Design an enzyme around this catalytic site. Structure first.
Site, PDB file in Angstrom:
ATOM      1  N   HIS B 202       0.789  -1.235   0.000  1.00 14.37           N
ATOM      2  CA  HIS B 202       0.000   0.000   0.000  1.00 14.37           C
ATOM      3  C   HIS B 202       0.826   1.292   0.000  1.00 14.37           C
ATOM      4  N   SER B 206       1.526  -0.976  -6.485  1.00  8.94           N
ATOM      5  CA  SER B 206       2.022  -1.992  -7.377  1.00  8.94           C
ATOM      6  C   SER B 206       2.956  -1.376  -8.400  1.00  8.94           C
ATOM      7  N   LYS B 228     -11.768  -7.432 -13.370  1.00  4.47           N
ATOM      8  CA  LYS B 228     -10.681  -8.123 -14.042  1.00  4.47           C
ATOM      9  C   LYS B 228     -10.234  -9.293 -13.126  1.00  4.47           C
ATOM     10  N   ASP B 229     -10.243  -9.100 -11.801  1.00  5.96           N
ATOM     11  CA  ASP B 229      -9.874 -10.177 -10.870  1.00  5.96           C
ATOM     12  C   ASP B 229     -10.879 -11.314 -11.001  1.00  5.96           C
ATOM     13  N   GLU B 272       5.960 -34.722  -2.084  1.00  5.68           N
ATOM     14  CA  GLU B 272       4.878 -34.023  -2.757  1.00  5.68           C
ATOM     15  C   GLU B 272       5.545 -33.224  -3.898  1.00  5.68           C
TER      16      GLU B 272
HETATM   17  C1  HEC Z   1       8.539 -14.305  -2.249  1.00  7.26           C
HETATM   18  C2  HEC Z   1       7.641 -13.397  -2.836  1.00  7.26           C
HETATM   19  C3  HEC Z   1       6.248 -13.289  -2.523  1.00  7.26           C
HETATM   20  C4  HEC Z   1       5.407 -14.198  -1.966  1.00  7.26           C
HETATM   21  C5  HEC Z   1       5.661 -15.659  -1.559  1.00  7.26           C
HETATM   22  C6  HEC Z   1       4.123 -13.554  -1.825  1.00  7.26           C
HETATM   23  N1  HEC Z   1       4.173 -12.280  -2.358  1.00  7.26           N
HETATM   24 FE1  HEC Z   1       2.618 -11.021  -2.799  1.00  7.26          FE
HETATM   25  N2  HEC Z   1       3.812  -9.722  -3.694  1.00  7.26           N
HETATM   26  C7  HEC Z   1       5.175  -9.854  -3.828  1.00  7.26           C
HETATM   27  C8  HEC Z   1       5.707  -8.704  -4.499  1.00  7.26           C
HETATM   28  C9  HEC Z   1       7.211  -8.449  -4.653  1.00  7.26           C
HETATM   29  C10 HEC Z   1       4.650  -7.946  -4.897  1.00  7.26           C
HETATM   30  C11 HEC Z   1       4.696  -6.644  -5.714  1.00  7.26           C
HETATM   31  C12 HEC Z   1       4.529  -6.982  -7.178  1.00  7.26           C
HETATM   32  C13 HEC Z   1       4.540  -5.763  -8.067  1.00  7.26           C
HETATM   33  O1  HEC Z   1       3.772  -4.811  -7.832  1.00  7.26           O
HETATM   34  O2  HEC Z   1       5.316  -5.750  -9.026  1.00  7.26           O
HETATM   35  C14 HEC Z   1       3.455  -8.588  -4.399  1.00  7.26           C
HETATM   36  C15 HEC Z   1       2.150  -8.124  -4.586  1.00  7.26           C
HETATM   37  C16 HEC Z   1       1.009  -8.728  -4.072  1.00  7.26           C
HETATM   38  C17 HEC Z   1      -0.349  -8.317  -4.323  1.00  7.26           C
HETATM   39  C18 HEC Z   1      -0.814  -7.293  -5.338  1.00  7.26           C
HETATM   40  C19 HEC Z   1      -1.259  -7.891  -6.669  1.00  7.26           C
HETATM   41  C20 HEC Z   1      -0.161  -8.676  -7.372  1.00  7.26           C
HETATM   42  O3  HEC Z   1      -0.374  -9.887  -7.643  1.00  7.26           O
HETATM   43  O4  HEC Z   1       0.902  -8.068  -7.676  1.00  7.26           O
HETATM   44  C21 HEC Z   1      -1.140  -9.054  -3.514  1.00  7.26           C
HETATM   45  C22 HEC Z   1      -2.672  -8.885  -3.329  1.00  7.26           C
HETATM   46  C23 HEC Z   1      -0.295 -10.054  -2.897  1.00  7.26           C
HETATM   47  N3  HEC Z   1       1.011  -9.864  -3.302  1.00  7.26           N
HETATM   48  C24 HEC Z   1      -0.743 -11.106  -2.090  1.00  7.26           C
HETATM   49  C25 HEC Z   1       0.036 -12.156  -1.585  1.00  7.26           C
HETATM   50  C26 HEC Z   1      -0.465 -13.248  -0.781  1.00  7.26           C
HETATM   51  C27 HEC Z   1      -1.960 -13.358  -0.356  1.00  7.26           C
HETATM   52  C28 HEC Z   1       0.557 -14.132  -0.619  1.00  7.26           C
HETATM   53  C29 HEC Z   1       0.651 -15.414  -0.012  1.00  7.26           C
HETATM   54  C30 HEC Z   1      -0.286 -16.157   0.720  1.00  7.26           C
HETATM   55  C31 HEC Z   1       1.703 -13.580  -1.303  1.00  7.26           C
HETATM   56  N4  HEC Z   1       1.386 -12.340  -1.824  1.00  7.26           N
HETATM   57  C32 HEC Z   1       2.971 -14.158  -1.324  1.00  7.26           C
HETATM   58  C33 HEC Z   1       5.934 -10.953  -3.413  1.00  7.26           C
HETATM   59  C34 HEC Z   1       5.472 -12.092  -2.760  1.00  7.26           C
HETATM   60  C1  LIG Z   2      -2.214  -2.552  -4.964  1.00  3.99           C
HETATM   61  O1  LIG Z   2      -2.685  -3.774  -5.462  1.00  3.99           O
HETATM   62  C2  LIG Z   2      -3.743  -4.643  -5.093  1.00  3.99           C
HETATM   63  C3  LIG Z   2      -4.322  -4.532  -3.747  1.00  3.99           C
HETATM   64  O2  LIG Z   2      -3.897  -3.689  -2.940  1.00  3.99           O
HETATM   65  C4  LIG Z   2      -5.415  -5.428  -3.354  1.00  3.99           C
HETATM   66  C5  LIG Z   2      -5.950  -5.234  -1.929  1.00  3.99           C
HETATM   67  C6  LIG Z   2      -5.911  -6.367  -4.232  1.00  3.99           C
HETATM   68  C7  LIG Z   2      -7.101  -7.353  -3.856  1.00  3.99           C
HETATM   69  C8  LIG Z   2      -6.743  -8.604  -3.128  1.00  3.99           C
HETATM   70  C9  LIG Z   2      -6.867  -8.851  -1.761  1.00  3.99           C
HETATM   71  C10 LIG Z   2      -7.415  -7.765  -0.806  1.00  3.99           C
HETATM   72  C11 LIG Z   2      -6.498 -10.177  -1.035  1.00  3.99           C
HETATM   73  C12 LIG Z   2      -6.762 -10.142   0.490  1.00  3.99           C
HETATM   74  C13 LIG Z   2      -6.867 -11.377   1.283  1.00  3.99           C
HETATM   75  C14 LIG Z   2      -6.874 -11.591   2.664  1.00  3.99           C
HETATM   76  C15 LIG Z   2      -6.760 -10.439   3.688  1.00  3.99           C
HETATM   77  C16 LIG Z   2      -6.988 -12.961   3.365  1.00  3.99           C
HETATM   78  C17 LIG Z   2      -7.491 -13.055   4.809  1.00  3.99           C
HETATM   79  C18 LIG Z   2      -7.871 -14.422   5.167  1.00  3.99           C
HETATM   80  C19 LIG Z   2      -8.728 -15.127   6.025  1.00  3.99           C
HETATM   81  C20 LIG Z   2      -8.702 -16.661   5.957  1.00  3.99           C
HETATM   82  C21 LIG Z   2      -9.733 -14.555   7.067  1.00  3.99           C
HETATM   83  C22 LIG Z   2     -10.173 -15.443   8.254  1.00  3.99           C
HETATM   84  C23 LIG Z   2     -11.491 -16.118   8.115  1.00  3.99           C
HETATM   85  C24 LIG Z   2     -12.290 -16.871   8.982  1.00  3.99           C
HETATM   86  C25 LIG Z   2     -11.924 -17.194  10.433  1.00  3.99           C
HETATM   87  C26 LIG Z   2     -13.661 -17.480   8.598  1.00  3.99           C
HETATM   88  C27 LIG Z   2     -13.796 -18.990   8.442  1.00  3.99           C
HETATM   89  C28 LIG Z   2     -14.746 -19.539   9.416  1.00  3.99           C
HETATM   90  C29 LIG Z   2     -16.123 -19.757   9.409  1.00  3.99           C
HETATM   91  C30 LIG Z   2     -17.045 -19.416   8.227  1.00  3.99           C
HETATM   92  C31 LIG Z   2     -16.928 -20.363  10.588  1.00  3.99           C
HETATM   93  C32 LIG Z   2     -17.778 -21.592  10.230  1.00  3.99           C
HETATM   94  C33 LIG Z   2     -18.554 -22.148  11.360  1.00  3.99           C
HETATM   95  C34 LIG Z   2     -19.918 -22.396  11.564  1.00  3.99           C
HETATM   96  C35 LIG Z   2     -20.526 -22.990  12.840  1.00  3.99           C
HETATM   97  C36 LIG Z   2     -21.015 -22.111  10.547  1.00  3.99           C
HETATM   98  C37 LIG Z   2      -5.324  -6.462  -5.568  1.00  3.99           C
HETATM   99  O3  LIG Z   2      -5.760  -7.297  -6.368  1.00  3.99           O
HETATM  100  C38 LIG Z   2      -4.231  -5.573  -5.965  1.00  3.99           C
HETATM  101  O4  LIG Z   2      -3.751  -5.744  -7.248  1.00  3.99           O
HETATM  102  C39 LIG Z   2      -4.484  -5.629  -8.453  1.00  3.99           C
HETATM  103  C1  LIG Z   3       6.870 -28.210  13.856  1.00  2.38           C
HETATM  104  C2  LIG Z   3       7.227 -27.743  12.506  1.00  2.38           C
HETATM  105  C3  LIG Z   3       8.265 -28.198  11.772  1.00  2.38           C
HETATM  106  C4  LIG Z   3       9.200 -29.263  12.262  1.00  2.38           C
HETATM  107  C5  LIG Z   3       8.492 -27.625  10.449  1.00  2.38           C
HETATM  108  C6  LIG Z   3       9.431 -28.034   9.572  1.00  2.38           C
HETATM  109  C7  LIG Z   3       9.612 -27.428   8.262  1.00  2.38           C
HETATM  110  C8  LIG Z   3      10.579 -27.815   7.413  1.00  2.38           C
HETATM  111  C9  LIG Z   3      10.811 -27.252   6.055  1.00  2.38           C
HETATM  112  O1  LIG Z   3       9.866 -26.194   5.750  1.00  2.38           O
HETATM  113  C10 LIG Z   3      10.304 -24.895   6.156  1.00  2.38           C
HETATM  114  C11 LIG Z   3      10.639 -28.381   4.996  1.00  2.38           C
HETATM  115  C12 LIG Z   3       9.198 -28.859   4.943  1.00  2.38           C
HETATM  116  C13 LIG Z   3      11.111 -27.889   3.621  1.00  2.38           C
HETATM  117  O2  LIG Z   3      12.542 -27.682   3.690  1.00  2.38           O
HETATM  118  C14 LIG Z   3      12.963 -26.352   3.419  1.00  2.38           C
HETATM  119  C15 LIG Z   3      10.832 -28.899   2.499  1.00  2.38           C
HETATM  120  C16 LIG Z   3      11.395 -28.349   1.200  1.00  2.38           C
HETATM  121  C17 LIG Z   3      11.417 -30.290   2.819  1.00  2.38           C
HETATM  122  C18 LIG Z   3      11.479 -31.099   1.547  1.00  2.38           C
HETATM  123  C19 LIG Z   3      11.650 -32.595   1.691  1.00  2.38           C
HETATM  124  O3  LIG Z   3      10.398 -33.221   1.714  1.00  2.38           O
HETATM  125  C20 LIG Z   3      10.358 -34.602   1.798  1.00  2.38           C
HETATM  126  C21 LIG Z   3       9.059 -35.167   1.817  1.00  2.38           C
HETATM  127  O4  LIG Z   3       8.021 -34.309   1.769  1.00  2.38           O
HETATM  128  C22 LIG Z   3       8.920 -36.587   1.880  1.00  2.38           C
HETATM  129  O5  LIG Z   3       7.616 -37.054   1.899  1.00  2.38           O
HETATM  130  C23 LIG Z   3       7.411 -38.436   1.580  1.00  2.38           C
HETATM  131  C24 LIG Z   3      10.047 -37.411   1.919  1.00  2.38           C
HETATM  132  C25 LIG Z   3      11.317 -36.837   1.907  1.00  2.38           C
HETATM  133  O6  LIG Z   3      12.453 -37.598   1.935  1.00  2.38           O
HETATM  134  C26 LIG Z   3      12.413 -38.825   1.227  1.00  2.38           C
HETATM  135  C27 LIG Z   3      11.511 -35.406   1.855  1.00  2.38           C
HETATM  136  C28 LIG Z   3      12.853 -34.753   1.856  1.00  2.38           C
HETATM  137  O7  LIG Z   3      13.922 -35.385   1.917  1.00  2.38           O
HETATM  138  C29 LIG Z   3      12.833 -33.278   1.762  1.00  2.38           C
HETATM  139  C30 LIG Z   3      14.146 -32.571   1.742  1.00  2.38           C
END
Ligand code: HEC
Ligand SMILES: COc1c(O)c(C)c(C/C=C(\C)CC/C=C(\C)CC/C=C(/C)CC/C=C(\C)CC/C=C(\C)CCC=C(C)C)c(O)c1OC
Ligand SMILES: C/C=C(C)/C=C/C=C/[C@H](OC)[C@@H](C)[C@@H](OC)[C@@H](C)CCc1oc2c(O)c(OC)cc(OC)c2c(=O)c1C
Ligand code: HEC
Ligand code: HEC
Lengths: 55, 385, 125, 93, 62, 245
Positions: B202, B206, B228-229, B272
């Site tokens: 923010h 972007s 567009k999204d 995986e």
């Molecule tokens: C390691 C890199 C990386 C990871 C992983 C990452 N982001 Fe980003 N994200 C960026 C960067 C850098 C930008 C800025 C891109 C630009 O404007 O050129 C960005 C921008 C964004 C934007 C703006 C729209 C877009 O696509 O550019 C959103 C929304 C966003 N990220 C959401 C997320 C969410 C949600 C996750 C994960 C759950 C995530 N990002 C993980 C690097 C990352």
């Molecule tokens: C400057 O550039 C931007 C930009 O700024 C933004 C905001 C967007 C738009 C995208 C987003 C805002 C993504 C945001 C996403 C999040 C904040 C994720 C948050 C996630 C959650 C999982 C919230 C937590 C939810 C829960 C606890 C609810 C689940 C539980 C339930 C329903 C209870 C069920 C139980 C019963 C008994 C019924 C853009 O696309 C973009 O580039 C074009």
């Molecule tokens: C309490 C929380 C804990 C302990 C978190 C731990 C997190 C660790 C790391 O994440 C940050 C780790 C997952 C990440 O390493 C960077 C992955 C790339 C590891 C990749 C990975 O996978 C395997 C796997 O999936 C298998 O399945 C059947 C079997 C495997 O051998 C045969 C592997 C294996 O040899 C490796 C290197």
């Protein structure tokens, strides 16, 4: 398309009508799909197998 | 002023989703972020509903998942959405990261944005591993065993950390119960990190495909990018749907449909798919400690890019050598993955070692050398003296 | 990488008839493949501006060049978003692709480097 | 409110760009435009252009990697067949 | 050039013989998207809500 | 790795359930159950399948009730606390041949016949593999193969040496519907039955997919159109520059 202007007259469709149409769609669409699906699989279904059974 | 602007809660919504000034030229590659938020939501919602029917005890975990599959109404849909969704979450994250790499999004003033993203990536990898262990199939048990063992490479206290992580002599009940508890927690920490990620986004907004300022021509997020999204949201759901309903197990491993057995490691064990490139990197080093250090370094090296990119322009759009090597990097990464899926056999071992070199050489050698050359080429091609 | 450094290396190549005849043609081909000229841009319009040197430089740019850069940048975004290139007759010609911002940048880097030198000057008695 | 740090982006009315003068823009309501159907005959041959300039950057690295992959695979197949067990013992350990 | 001389939009503009042509098409599309979405949301909500109803294995007739 | 160690790749048979629009063939499921009961059940458990799931799939409510009652299950202790048995009900799970792992190994030269509830999903190749394995026992192993005592050769099993001998032979079962019980026919049937055991939601899952994919496809095509409309003013926008005096 003048077909639109007869029902909604230049205005967009309102949510109330959208919601109402959705409930209708849900039922109609489901029957249409189930029908096609069961027909496409005629002979394989349990309904069909039960017809050729008597115990 | 308008209520959407004056209200304390709505103004946040307005500044981030409605009036947020976007560069007019961002392309569909900028739609990945919203897709990631959507993925986060799908994982959380489906996981909570499944948690309602899941038992973490090592004797019941596998059967409790079979129970979700067989007895819970629409249970198979929830499990298949969750499992396939995790994979889709990685496909989209790689694209989001690759987009960043290509367009110089990691550059100043977006360094903080990039660093937070790297943290999210690590957290996401950890979250998926914790979930995978919850099924308690064969791959779950050995995955938990191998990965917790990564820490044994730490000198002196390593084996102590492992016994502490396990809660005993080996991967057992204490282990699976704590992994489920942790699997439930991390997604919420990821959510908090996403907010921090959006906060950094923010303040500078972007970037765009041209790599230059977007300040001369912005258009509101609302309407344009909201709709567009929507286009990619539906395409994303359509494809996810094809897998969930028509090919739900294609992205998994058949061994995870076998309860975990502490006395037998299948010869067919394979990580995986989204973890394969990293696994290959580790396997390429014939030393325990160095294998785990190099693998972790493969993730941390992403932090180096803002410093090794010497170019004076952001992004690869107008850079011939950089575009070429970027694709060398991408395909080299896919190779690393294909090597991870192969046996530790002759041609493969050497190919993996070379691909591993290419992976690190890209950030540490290729980019700084090539960007410097391109800088000079841009200059001498126009200066007449 | 500073522009002072790019200039150092570039000028050394441009002076030596050995390198000058070997590199320039390569560089010229690189510039055409880049494609920025087909969008109506000049290379200097492509320089990342989010740093103090570039802000000082853009601030010092005469009005007419400033309004020109603005139009070129806006025109490039609009063309990019339409997924087209400009009509060939509108492309920037090599004669026009001049380093117009370069002198302002070099001047600012020198001023900056001197301040850094003076703030850290040691003294010997 | 609390003082905010200077950035490279402002908001509507103070975006942070340079002062604009001389540029005049024109646009026409989407309502007044020909409903989506004209994206053909005029917008078809023009398309596919943003990949005719890029395919080489993608294809060459792809080709190099696919060839390299195919080669190592076919070599592994040979090594584990009867014909190659001799070479296998040699290159193995 | 004079700002009063509006550039050519002929390639984009429709030969207006049917004034509300683009409007009817847009509103039909917007309306249909709104319809299929609502039905989709309804189905998604019911899927999740029903997962909480008595499981197949607990409906034992004692 | 050597071909023998990998195992022979199973070919692709034309299963009637292959295809996005195809349901299982329920008559084949019905027959498959018989083959399971009369041949397989002697060594293979089917722990995750409850009697009630058969109803409306391959058998009638009445038929399943009779089948369940042929087995005794532990019941709740009587008024005095002594244990007592009880005939089976629909809520029960299909019982297995052995009481524990140790008893199962003893009856099979030390080998353990896996449960077949998920066997189709727990192996690469799915139906193609299971079928091929059952119909792929050669009368004699290829020349040079030193097969361990008690083992059997099968080209489709990794390593070729499998602890299960061929068990399907022509006409060893008398199909209730008159179908000729050839070995390949019986293999085709149990395999179809085992696919259902592992994926009971199959028919319904594909029906839902059909509706889901149609709605999402439409929504996708529709959003494209709406987006283009909402962007028309921006896309066709035109600029003109008149440098200031
Ligand atoms: C390691 C890199 C990386 C990871 C992983 C990452 N982001 Fe980003 N994200 C960026 C960067 C850098 C930008 C800025 C891109 C630009 O404007 O050129 C960005 C921008 C964004 C934007 C703006 C729209 C877009 O696509 O550019 C959103 C929304 C966003 N990220 C959401 C997320 C969410 C949600 C996750 C994960 C759950 C995530 N990002 C993980 C690097 C990352
Ligand atoms: C400057 O550039 C931007 C930009 O700024 C933004 C905001 C967007 C738009 C995208 C987003 C805002 C993504 C945001 C996403 C999040 C904040 C994720 C948050 C996630 C959650 C999982 C919230 C937590 C939810 C829960 C606890 C609810 C689940 C539980 C339930 C329903 C209870 C069920 C139980 C019963 C008994 C019924 C853009 O696309 C973009 O580039 C074009
Ligand atoms: C309490 C929380 C804990 C302990 C978190 C731990 C997190 C660790 C790391 O994440 C940050 C780790 C997952 C990440 O390493 C960077 C992955 C790339 C590891 C990749 C990975 O996978 C395997 C796997 O999936 C298998 O399945 C059947 C079997 C495997 O051998 C045969 C592997 C294996 O040899 C490796 C290197
Ligand atoms: C006891 C005499 C058996 C009868 C009757 C059948 N099976 Fe069997 N099966 C048996 C053993 C001892 C084993 C173990 C094999 C090993 O080497 O460990 C098996 C195994 C299977 C498998 C799994 C094979 C695999 O890929 O690991 C399958 C798919 C299988 N059996 C199927 C099967 C079917 C469908 C049968 C009736 C038609 C059948 N088995 C009968 C022992 C015995
Ligand atoms: C409790 C809430 C909960 C949350 C929050 C949650 N999960 Fe899960 N997840 C589970 C449960 C329950 C299981 C076991 C059921 C299953 O196997 O699908 C599971 C299993 C998994 C699996 C194994 C899938 C398989 O093959 O069966 C993965 C991978 C996974 N989760 C990824 C994620 C990711 C990625 C996130 C977050 C972005 C996440 N989970 C969030 C509860 C949750």
């Amino acid at each position: 398309s003048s077909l639109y202007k007869t029902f909604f007259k230049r205005n967009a469709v309102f949510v109330g009508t959208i919601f109402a149409g959705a409930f209708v769609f849900q039922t109609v669409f489901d029957t249409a799909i189930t029908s096609w699906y069961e027909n496409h699989n005629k002979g394989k279904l349990w309904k069909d197998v039960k017809a050729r059974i008597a115990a | 002023m308008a209520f959407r602007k004056s209200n304390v809660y709505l103004s946040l919504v307005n500044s981030y989703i409605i009036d947020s000034p976007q560069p007019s030229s961002i392309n569909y590659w900028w739609n990945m972020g919203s897709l990631l938020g959507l993925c986060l939501v799908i994982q959380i919602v489906t996981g909570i509903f499944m948690a309602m029917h899941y038992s973490s005890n090592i004797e019941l975990a596998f059967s409790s998942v079979e129970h979700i599959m067989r007895d819970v109404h629409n249970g198979y849909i929830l499990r298949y959405l969750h499992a396939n969704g995790a994979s889709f979450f990685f496909m989209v994250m790689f694209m989001h990261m690759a987009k960043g790499l290509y367009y110089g999004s990691y550059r100043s003033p977006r360094v903080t944005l990039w660093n937070v993203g790297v943290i999210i990536f690590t957290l996401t990898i950890a979250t998926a591993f914790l979930g995978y262990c919850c099924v308690y199939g064969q791959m779950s048990h050995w995955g938990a065993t191998v990965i917790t063992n990564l820490f044994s490479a730490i000198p002196f206290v390593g084996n102590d950390i492992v016994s502490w992580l396990w809660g005993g002599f080996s991967v057992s009940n204490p282990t699976i119960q704590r992994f489920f508890a942790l699997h439930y927690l991390v997604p919420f920490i990821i959510a908090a990190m996403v907010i921090m990620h959006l906060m950094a986004l923010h303040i500078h907004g972007s970037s765009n495909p041209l790599g230059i300022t977007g300040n001369l021509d912005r258009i509101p997020m609302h309407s344009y990018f909201i709709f567009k999204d929507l286009v990619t949201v539906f395409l994303f759901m359509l494809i996810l749907a094809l897998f969930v309903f028509y090919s739900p197990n294609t992205l998994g491993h058949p061994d995870n449909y076998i309860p975990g057995n502490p006395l037998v490691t299948p010869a067919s064990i394979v990580p995986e798919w989204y973890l394969l490139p990293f696994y290959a990197i580790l396997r390429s080093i014939p030393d325990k400690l160095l294998g785990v250090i190099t693998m972790f370094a493969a993730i941390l090296v992403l932090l180096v890019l803002p410093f090794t990119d010497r170019s004076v322009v952001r992004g690869n759009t107008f850079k011939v050598l950089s575009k070429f090597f970027f694709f060398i990097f991408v395909f080299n990464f896919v190779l690393l993955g294909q090597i991870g899926a192969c046996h530790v056999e002759v041609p493969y071992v050497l190919m993996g070692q070379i691909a591993t070199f290419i992976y690190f050489a890209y950030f540490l050698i290729i980019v700084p050398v090539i960007s410097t050359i391109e800088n000079v080429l841009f200059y001498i091609g126009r200066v007449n003296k | 990488q500073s522009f002072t450094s790019i200039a150092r290396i570039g000028d050394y190549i441009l002076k030596s008839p050995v390198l000058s005849k070997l590199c320039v043609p390569v560089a010229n081909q690189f510039i055409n493949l880049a494609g920025y000229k087909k969008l109506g841009l000049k290379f200097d319009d492509l320089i990342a501006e989010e740093n103090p040197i570039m802000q000082t430089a853009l601030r010092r740019l005469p009005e007419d060049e400033s309004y020109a850069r603005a139009y070129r940048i806006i025109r490039a975004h609009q063309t990019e978003l339409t997924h087209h290139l400009l009509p060939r007759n509108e492309w920037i010609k090599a004669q026009e692709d001049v380093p117009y911002l370069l002198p302002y940048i070099l001047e600012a880097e020198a001023a900056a480097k001197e301040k850094d030198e003076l703030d850290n000057i040691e003294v010997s008695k | 409110g609390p003082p905010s740090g200077k950035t490279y982006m402002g908001w509507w009315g103070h975006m942070g760009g340079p002062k604009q003068k001389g540029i005049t823009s024109y646009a026409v309501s989407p309502y007044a435009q020909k409903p989506l159907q004209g994206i053909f005959h005029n917008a078809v041959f023009n398309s596919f252009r943003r990949f005719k300039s890029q395919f080489l950057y993608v294809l060459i690295p792809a080709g190099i990697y696919w060839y390299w992959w195919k080669n190592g695979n076919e070599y592994n197949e040979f090594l584990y067949s009867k014909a190659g067990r001799e070479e296998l013992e040699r290159v193995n350990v | 050039k004079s700002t009063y001389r509006t550039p050519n939009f002929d390639d984009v503009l429709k030969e207006n013989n049917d004034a509300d042509k683009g409007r009817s098409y847009a509103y039909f599309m917007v309306g249909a998207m709104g319809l299929l979405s609502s039905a989709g949301a309804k189905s998604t909500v019911e899927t999740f809500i029903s997962s909480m109803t008595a499981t197949a294995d607990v409906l034992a007739m004692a | 790795m050597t071909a023998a160690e990998h195992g022979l790749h199973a070919p692709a048979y034309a299963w009637s359930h292959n295809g996005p629009f195809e349901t299982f063939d329920h008559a084949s499921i019905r027959r498959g159950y018989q083959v399971y009961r009369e041949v397989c059940a002697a060594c293979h458990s089917l722990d995750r399948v409850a009697w009630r799931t058969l109803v409306g799939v391959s058998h009638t409510n009445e038929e399943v009730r009779n089948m369940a009652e042929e087995f005794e299950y532990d019941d709740e202790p009587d008024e005095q606390g002594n244990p007592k048995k009880r005939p089976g009900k629909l809520s029960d799970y299909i019982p297995g041949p052995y009481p524990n792992e140790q008893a199962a190994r003893a009856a099979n030269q030390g080998a353990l016949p896996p449960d077949l509830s998920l066997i189709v999903k727990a192996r690469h190749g799915g139906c193609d593999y299971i079928f091929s394995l059952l119909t792929g026992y050669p009368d004699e192993p290829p020349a040079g193969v030193a097969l361990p005592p008690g083992s059997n050769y099968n080209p489709y099993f990794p390593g070729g040496s499998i602890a299960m001998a061929r068990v399907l032979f022509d006409d060893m079962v008398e199909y209730e519907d008159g179908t000729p019980a050839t070995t390949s026919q019986m293999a085709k049937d149990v395999t179809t039955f085992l696919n259902w055991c592992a994926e009971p939601e199959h028919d319904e899952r594909k029906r839902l997919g059909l509706k889901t994919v149609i709605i999402l496809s439409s929504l996708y095509l529709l959003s494209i159109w709406v987006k283009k409309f909402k962007w028309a003013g921006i896309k066709t926008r035109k600029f003109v520059f008149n440098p200031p005096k």
